Amino acid sequence: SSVPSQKTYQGSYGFRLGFLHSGTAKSVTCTYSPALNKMFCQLAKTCPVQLWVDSTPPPGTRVRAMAIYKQSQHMTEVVRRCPHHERCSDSDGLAPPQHLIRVEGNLRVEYLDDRNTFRHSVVVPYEPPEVGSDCTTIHYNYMCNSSCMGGMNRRPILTIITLEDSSGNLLGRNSFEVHVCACPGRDRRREEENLR
Ligand SMILES: [Zn+2]
Secondary structure, three states: OOOOOOOOEOOOOOOEEEOOOOOOOOOOOEEEEOOOOEEEEOOOOOEEEEEEOOOOOOOOOEEEEEEEEOOHHHOOOOOOOOHHHHHOOOOOOOOOOOOOEEEOOOOOOEEEEOOOOOOEEEEEEOOOOOOOOOOEEEEEEEOOOOOOOOOOOOOOEEEEEEEEOOOOOEEEEEEEEEEEOOOHHHHHHHHHHOOO
16 A cells, blocks of 8 residues: 555656567576566676666656565565675675665665665666667666575565656656576576466
């Protein structure tokens, strides 16, 4: 009832998500399944997420990411890191050690513990598409495995990407499921046959 919305809205700017066409080889650290709308990635590795827009949001626009549990009986529970990982210092001195989602390669990164919902989120300033690219790419890191006991503990999660203005007004929203694991390529292949 107080759970964050995961409803898709492209909004004024035609906000869409995009992902690299990376394939499923062993060496891949991040691979996306268009069939599943699901990202398979490695712990603490680079996870490119693309922002596609029909119109450019003004400077000052922010991009927020938040994880929630997929299943209804776990949706009220705040997605956080497991004790083991929250106890180690893989902490970059910006991210709170409890946050599952980080952004790498951005010194303007901002982290939030919601005063009321206790939910974690990470936000970065929106920048217009790179040279030689028609989208804007953000590098996320997931700091726990899906399997991590005492954390997600094999419970499936979604990442909600929100576009908001400098004043916090919602502009658009999208989402994708993510599975954090040692063999992203292997698992994508497996889950894509599981449809059949
Ligand atoms: Zn963990």
